[PDB]
Design an enzyme around this catalytic site. Structure first.
Site, PDB file in Angstrom:
ATOM      1  N   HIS B 260      -9.000  10.981 -43.903  1.00 19.01           N
ATOM      2  CA  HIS B 260      -9.961  10.216 -43.601  1.00 19.01           C
ATOM      3  C   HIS B 260     -10.785  10.630 -42.618  1.00 19.01           C
ATOM      4  CE1 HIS B 260     -11.563   5.893 -43.796  1.00 19.01           C
ATOM      5  NE2 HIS B 260     -12.024   6.274 -42.639  1.00 19.01           N
ATOM      6  N   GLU B 261     -10.462  10.703 -41.462  1.00 14.03           N
ATOM      7  CA  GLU B 261     -11.473  11.416 -40.537  1.00 14.03           C
ATOM      8  C   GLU B 261     -12.258  12.628 -40.902  1.00 14.03           C
ATOM      9  OE1 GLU B 261     -12.777   9.035 -38.393  1.00 14.03           O
ATOM     10  OE2 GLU B 261     -11.359   7.922 -38.720  1.00 14.03           O
ATOM     11  N   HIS B 264     -15.106  11.988 -43.006  1.00 10.14           N
ATOM     12  CA  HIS B 264     -16.338  11.739 -42.285  1.00 10.14           C
ATOM     13  C   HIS B 264     -16.894  12.986 -41.546  1.00 10.14           C
ATOM     14  CE1 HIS B 264     -16.177   7.253 -42.272  1.00 10.14           C
ATOM     15  NE2 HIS B 264     -15.082   7.052 -41.752  1.00 10.14           N
ATOM     16  N   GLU B 290     -18.287   6.064 -45.066  1.00 13.33           N
ATOM     17  CA  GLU B 290     -17.018   5.670 -45.311  1.00 13.33           C
ATOM     18  C   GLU B 290     -16.596   6.050 -46.988  1.00 13.33           C
ATOM     19  OE1 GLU B 290     -13.424   3.453 -44.162  1.00 13.33           O
ATOM     20  OE2 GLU B 290     -14.978   4.830 -43.528  1.00 13.33           O
TER      21      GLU B 290
END
Ligand SMILES: [Zn+2]
Ligand SMILES: [Zn+2]
Lengths: 497, 497
Positions: B260-261, B264, B290
């Protein structure tokens, strides 16, 4: 009175700029990704410019003048104002444009050095060193109170120290340590091969953190990380961080780097809470700072009582590696001596010969007696004469140390040797006051040694000048006596000489 | 030309302050020692003040006015000026006094929350939330162009987004996802017990870094560390750092936090170099940002093709743990669904019900229809209504999320759901332009997907408005269509529903 609150807030702002700058540098040495070097340097320059503006702010200067003309200040507050005015004096003497020019040049010098050293390309660094020498002389000329420009740099490192006082101390150390080292080298070394058996990195770090925790290092006010080059840096009133470097092929490297940097950090961590965020809230000089790293590393960390206390934990952590090794053998292996090339790795007896070499080359360059283009040859010549051997190229010759490539030429190294001397001077005064230090060390109890150093050295910060600090704490000015008595006694006993 | 050089230098100075502020926060979350909290906060406050002054400098504003009236600027330079003036407008719209008051209050609210949550002390936070609600309404009142204060916050999160548009997305997701989730929950879960067999923390991190490395994360321009809460932060133009959290009792946590990060970070790492250090050099909106974390985490990271490629490395790294487990079982185990309490851990199907809950409570509070002292009860009532269960106390009720305690109330959460929607919309456009992406993934080759996203999304940074970027990249405005089709297809086939 309202003026004092404003002075207090401006001082706290200067400390805060410094802490932020320290964070930029700490992160640069530990975790900065490889492709981010250029932006970080620009960030550092942005903060350098802002902090310099506040350190030289005219309004701040007026507040200092107001507080200086008072007659109702405590001894500490007046000294606080005096030190601030001395810092303000130095900060405004040099035009901000010259400061920026010098910073850009040595920054570019450094980059060229990170490539020319591995490439054995001293000829490439010569123009960089020539300009650095010229800029170093120009910087000193803004301070004509030092007739000798070398004295300006010696004083910048250790307030009140002079090149004649440095030369005297060096003469004494060379006259005593060369024979003592030669005799130790001729006697033969203790066994050392067990140090090469493989010591797991994570186990080394854990052991080091147990030791410095006993020393008194406060992990609520700091931490340790890995770097290529060990250092200590203060990011805030309660944030004094250290770094170490680990070689699985030799566990004494990481251990004694950690004890060394921890010593620096104890000094900073002992500064009085009332001085944090003020001009008095920091170490007072390079030599006094290095006296504390060297005290915890050498005088304590390499002593028989230290290993009487820690050999058990050491052998338990490294059971196979210490098989067939006694506690006495580990104590001896940590005190070997030899003529070597790398200053940072040099033993207790030959280390200062590296500093003298660099100091005397600085004297020759600043006086115009040695041209920088001849530095590489002069360095090898001095290493042969002072250490009895020569590096195979310039990689470990004149390119060895970064100092002259990332900063001025002059006064770059004598602080290391002054620190060595003062370590024994402060230590002896501590034992004079606490004759049972060794028995405490055998119990892993360093509280009285730490207590004495905090009361007599750390807490005062910059409240006293180095000379006042040394005389008050030890009863005498800088002297090589205790240092030579400690080394002659310790190594006379170790090697039968 | 002279005036433009000044703009670029001021823009770079704004970016550099931003990187330094980010470093202070990144270090605060990773390595700051416990006793250093107060000093770090004052340092951050000092830098916030300096950066705010730069961002509102009248001279800087004058340069922007001059440059905006020029007619010889390229479309990108004109857009930089437009973006800079829009930032300058909002930054000066809110009085500096109010900026400091709000910042100081949320700092005290946040600190009290870090203690009140574990203690189930919602009554203590009620006054903090009441002051926060009043200040949130006051902040929005400085922007009367938004008749509804909630529209000010919705637009602050996603430029051009409105409350009426958010409500339509919510209704559509609720109508489609509730029945699909209920059917999945009623069908029964795949085997998961092998995830509890114990996965060493060091191996989890190593595996996660190999995956995002293949994704395209550039470790020469970033790094990963451990923190309490995973996040992404930009410390410079070539320094995009991520953090993760490891649970040895469940390896899906660290893996999917990291993916997830990294998503980003991939977005930020793809911004065109020509925009770095300018007002265009960053992500365009919360929803678009996101969308990229969710694309790499869910659409890629939880797909069958992902585990066809990595189960081998996974199994080899954790052989006993995956004994008796097929590749297909690992794919099913990362796609379980259930009504749960914690928003950040919620599955693909029920996640949006948490965002809707929070948004509707924000709507009621901003309209004056829900009193802050009644929030704890309204939260539990909304969780029973929307997710079918309630937390045993306020710890995982209204105290659960930090947003309302460290920032304004209103518009705090819809970006998460917007990102979920856009993730599938962007992804489908990437497959339409590159038929056969899944086959690439089985080969650990993500260059076609990443290349498409970099060329059509990342490189532009803020060059296009959110609506323009989504429209140009995917051919249509924001729509839940691709999102609902993806979930219905994926979970319809996983659970036979
Ligand atoms: Zn040192
Ligand atoms: Zn996210």
């Amino acid at each position: 009175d309202t003026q004092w609150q404003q002075l207090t807030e401006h001082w706290q702002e200067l400390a805060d700029f410094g802490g932020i700058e320290a964070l930029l540098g700490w992160d640069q040495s530990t975790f900065l990704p490889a492709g981010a070097a250029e932006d970080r340097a620009r960030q550092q320059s942005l903060l350098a410019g802002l902090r310099h503006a506040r350190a030289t702010d005219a309004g701040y200067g007026k507040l200092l003048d107001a507080a200086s003309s008072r007659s109702d200040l405590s001894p500490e507050q007046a000294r606080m104002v005096q030190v601030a005015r001395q810092d303000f004096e130095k900060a405004t003497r040099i035009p901000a444009e010259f400061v920026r020019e010098f910073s850009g040049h040595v920054g570019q010098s450094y980059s060229a050095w990170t490539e020319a050293r591995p490439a054995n390309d001293f000829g490439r660094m010569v123009p960089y060193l020539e300009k650095t020498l010229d800029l170093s002389l120009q910087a000193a000329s803004y301070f004509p109170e030092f007739g000798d420009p070398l004295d300006y740099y010696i004083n910048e490192s250790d307030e009140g120290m002079t090149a004649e006082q440095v030369g005297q101390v060096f003469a004494e150390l060379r006259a005593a340590l060369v024979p003592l080292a030669d005799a130790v080298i001729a006697a033969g070394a203790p066994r050392t091969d067990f140090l090469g058996r493989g010591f797991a990195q994570e186990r080394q770090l854990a052991f080091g953190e147990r030791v410095i925790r006993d020393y008194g290092y406060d992990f609520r006010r700091g931490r340790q990380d890995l770097t290529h080059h060990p250092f200590m840096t203060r990011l805030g009133g309660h944030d004094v961080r250290i770094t170490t470097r680990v070689k699985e092929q030799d566990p004494t490297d990481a251990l004694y780097s950690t004890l060394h940097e921890a010593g620096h950090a104890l000094y900073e961590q002992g500064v009085d809470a009332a001085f944090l965020g003020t001009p008095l809230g920091g170490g007072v000089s390079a030599g006094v700072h290095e006296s504390q790293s060297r005290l915890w590393e050498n005088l304590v960390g390499r002593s028989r009582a230290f290993w009487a206390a820690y050999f058990g934990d050491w052998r338990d952590t490294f059971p196979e590696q210490l098989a067939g090794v006694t506690e006495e053998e580990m104590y001896r292996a940590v005190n070997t001596v030899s003529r070597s090339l790398i200053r940072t790795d040099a033993d207790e007896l030959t280390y200062n010969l590296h500093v003298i070499t660099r100091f005397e080359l600085e004297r020759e360059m600043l006086a115009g007696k040695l041209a920088v283009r001849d530095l590489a040859d002069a360095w090898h010549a001095a290493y042969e004469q002072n250490l009895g051997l020569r590096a195979p190229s310039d990689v470990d010759g004149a390119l060895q140390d970064v100092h002259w490539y990332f900063g001025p030429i002059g006064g770059s190294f004598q602080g290391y040797t002054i620190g060595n001397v003062l370590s024994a001077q402060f230590y002896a005064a501590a034992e004079a006051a606490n004759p049972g230090l060794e028995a405490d060390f055998a119990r892993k109890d360093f509280s009285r040694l730490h207590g004495w150093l905090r009361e007599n050295v750390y807490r005062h910060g910059r409240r006293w000048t180095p000379g006042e600090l040394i005389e008050r704490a030890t009863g005498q000015a800088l002297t090589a006596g205790p240092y030579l008595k400690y080394l002659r006694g310790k190594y006379g006993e170790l090697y039968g000489v």
